[PDB]
Amino acid sequence: NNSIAIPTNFSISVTTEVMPVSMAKTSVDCTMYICGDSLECSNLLLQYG
Amino acid sequence: DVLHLTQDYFLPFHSNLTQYFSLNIYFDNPILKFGDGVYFAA
Ligand SMILES: *[C@@H]1O[C@H](CO)[C@@H](O[C@@H]2O[C@H](CO)[C@@H](O)[C@H](O)[C@H]2NC(C)=O)[C@H](O)[C@H]1NC(C)=O
Ligand SMILES: *[C@@H]1O[C@H](CO)[C@@H](O)[C@H](O)[C@H]1NC(C)=O
Known part of the structure; x- marks a missing residue:
């Protein structure tokens, strides 16, 4: 109840922190993945248009 | 009222x-060529 600790010297410390910000941007083509260069398959894809 | 393809x-x-x-x-x-269809405008 009558004791206290007080510092007598200091130090300067440089730390690092790594933060993600953005990721890769992607695009997908409906044709050339579902029906690749097929006229019979692309004639049926319009019903899922 | 449709935008059908x-x-x-x-x-x-x-x-x-x-x-x-x-x-x-x-x-x-x-004697012309009749293929899958012909457009004729006179
Ligand atoms: C606090 O600590 C630093 C070291 O981190 C002390 O700096 C040293 O001081 C002595 C003399 O007191 C020099 O001979 C040294 O070159 C200094 N540097 C190092 C890296 O040892 C400093 O004196 C301390 N302060 C206090 C005890 O009040
Ligand atoms: C125009 O006629 C030429 C022949 O002169 C043909 O090769 C071409 O496909 C036609 N159309 C266009 C848009 O150039």
């Missing part, structure tokens, strides 16, 4: 048709 035979836009005349000063009607 077809896939059939059509005349392509900005295509080059042939011109056949019938002037007097001639009379030509050659």
Whole structure:
């Protein structure tokens, strides 16, 4: 109840922190993945248009 | 009231048709080609 600790010297410390910000941007083509260069398959894809 | 997309035979836009005349000063009607369809404008 009558004791206290007080510092007598200091130090300067440089730390690092790594933060993600953005990721890769992607695009997908409906044709050339579902029906690749097929006229019979692309004639049926319009019903899922 | 629909924006439906077809896939059939059509005349392509900005295509080059042939011109056949019938002037007097001639009379030509050659055997033309009928493929999947013919556009005829006289
Ligand atoms: C606090 O600590 C630093 C070291 O981190 C002390 O600096 C040293 O001081 C002595 C003399 O007291 C020099 O001979 C040294 O070159 C200094 N540097 C190092 C890296 O040892 C400093 O004196 C301390 N302060 C206090 C005890 O009040
Ligand atoms: C125009 O006619 C030419 C022949 O002169 C043809 O090769 C071409 O496909 C036609 N159309 C266009 C848009 O150039």
